[PDB]
């Protein structure tokens, strides 16, 4: 995986040049936003379960999917759906801390669409669930870091689509 530091290092390295100020300002901006990322990650790590709880309550509960015949009908499939949303929230927290969406398409997205197509998982329903996660964590954390979290959540949705 790559964070913003390794991203700008490899961007300098692929052209083989040293660090210029047009690259050093990227590291300065990342160190400006780092404490915001750390505090938002601490809030999300403290409140990881309740984000998923109110997200499923906002989006997936009392819908077609929990009814008999739905994809999250049995308790095994419900626990698998909660596990998937925990995966999405934790890896989006990782991407928010890194400041680069490399871990998302390098450890979540590279085959998950094929896996969901083989399992019959509703990708649009998972996208709506991740949007519910985004609204809950935006209300919980704040607008400034919630936007950065929502960028990687929409990255996860775009990889899923």
């Amino acid at each position: 995986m790559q964070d913003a530091i390794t991203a700008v290092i490899n961007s300098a390295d692929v052209q083989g040049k040293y660090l210029d100020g047009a690259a050093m300002d990227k590291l300065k901006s990342y160190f400006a936003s780092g404490e915001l990322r750390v505090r938002a990650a601490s809030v999300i790590s403290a409140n990881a379960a309740t984000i998923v709880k109110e997200a499923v309550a906002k989006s997936l509960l009392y819908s077609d999917v929990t009814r008999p015949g739905g994809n999250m009908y049995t308790t095994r499939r419900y626990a698998a759906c909660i596990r998937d949303l925990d995966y999405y929230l934790r890896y989006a927290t990782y991407a928010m801390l890194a400041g680069d969406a490399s871990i998302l398409d390098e450890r979540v997205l590279n085959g998950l669409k094929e896996t969901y197509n083989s399992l019959g998982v509703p990708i649009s329903s998972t996208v709506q669930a991740i949007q519910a996660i985004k609204e809950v964590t935006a209300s919980l954390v704040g607008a400034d870091a919630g936007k950065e979290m929502g960028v990687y959540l929409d990255y996860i949705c775009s990889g899923l689509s």
Binding site: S59, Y62, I123, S124, S125, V127, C157, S158, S161
Partner: protein
């Protein structure tokens, strides 16, 4: 198409339609999500003169 009609895209694969309409934009609120009819609360309605 007749002898005068340019061909046009008539049918899609489900995967292609999912790529087009499963992104963050262009996806409706009622596709795979329960829609709760939000309403002004009854106490706010009573508080309105």
């Amino acid at each position: 198409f007749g002898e005068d009609t340019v061909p046009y895209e008539r049918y899609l694969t489900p995967g292609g339609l999912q790529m087009r309409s499963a992104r963050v934009g262009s996806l409706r609120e009622d596709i795979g999500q329960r829609v709760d009819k939000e309403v002004t609360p009854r106490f706010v309605e009573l508080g309105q003169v």
